[PDB]
Amino acid sequence: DTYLHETLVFDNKLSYIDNQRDTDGPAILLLPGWCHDHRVYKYLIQELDADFRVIVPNWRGHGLSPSEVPDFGYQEQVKDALEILDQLGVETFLPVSHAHGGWVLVELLEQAGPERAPRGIIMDWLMWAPKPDFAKSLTLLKDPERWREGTHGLFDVWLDGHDEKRVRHHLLEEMADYGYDCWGRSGRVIEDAYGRNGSPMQMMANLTKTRPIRHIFSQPTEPEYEKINSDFAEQHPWFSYAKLGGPTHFPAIDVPDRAAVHIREFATAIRQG
Ligand SMILES: Cc1cc(=O)c2ccccc2[nH]1
């Protein structure tokens, strides 16, 4: 893309998107999950490009040229993200995560605090502790013999029986270059994240400074999942959610206009005070 840069972050050379838009705050920080990169956000960036500064960091070993790197977790993702923001001179930002990029977002809210990071948006992030099928998927990702079997089972869950051309292209072309080094790590880090923090809902409730957070999601589609979101929102005045009714796990790809309007609402709320 026209906006892709590379910088040295501590020991590692990381790629990142920066449209270097000169405009009012806040900056929109789009956080990828595990074993994909800024390509997941190409449609969402087009929705936001004109009106906001947009930054998308890629994690260690992530990007157009994936590589083997030493083991790292979401704490390093957070430091890598802040170091890129410091280099760029960004003060105030609205972070937006996909799936297990949420662990990075919630820890980023904690470390950055509510003046720099007054709100956050989490997209399609499993709010409950792993149910058997997802727990099984993580087990296979960590298996050096069965990791691709793991990825195939997740792609099935993510597409949810849809022939969704753009999402299939992301999973089968834009993620094809990621290996056991990434997918194995993703299994290990996510399993440890739930084990250590209990759940995304526990981790958000545990913030020193609670702030406005919206969960926007298309799946899981079952009423039981909507109910845990409604029960959390009813108990926590700062928490909201919207079911986007997109076909796949990837609303940034399949309903980028819908994601964008939630992000614009939060950016507008920050600008008013
Ligand atoms: C791209 C992406 C989405 C996910 O939900 C996920 C789940 C487990 C491991 C890695 C992952 N990576």
Tell me what the structure shows.
The chain has 273 residues and is α/β, with parallel strands linked by helices. It has one domain: Alpha/Beta hydrolase fold, catalytic domain (Rossmann fold, 3-Layer(aba) Sandwich), CATH 3.40.50.1820. The longest helix has 18 residues, at 180-197. The chain has an eight-stranded mixed beta sheet, with helices on both faces. The chain has eleven helices and eight strands. The chain is globular and about 50 Å long. Residues 33-36, 99-100, 154, 186, 190, 249 line the site of 2-methyl-quinolin-4(1H)-one. It catalyses: 3-hydroxy-2-methyl-1H-quinolin-4-one + O2 = N-acetylanthranilate + CO + H(+). Its EC number is 1.13.11.48. One of its GO terms (molecular function) is oxidoreductase activity, acting on single donors with incorporation of molecular oxygen, incorporation of two atoms of oxygen. Keywords: Dioxygenase, Oxidoreductase, Plasmid. The record marks 124 as: Increases basicity of active site His. The PDB classes it as oxidoreductase.
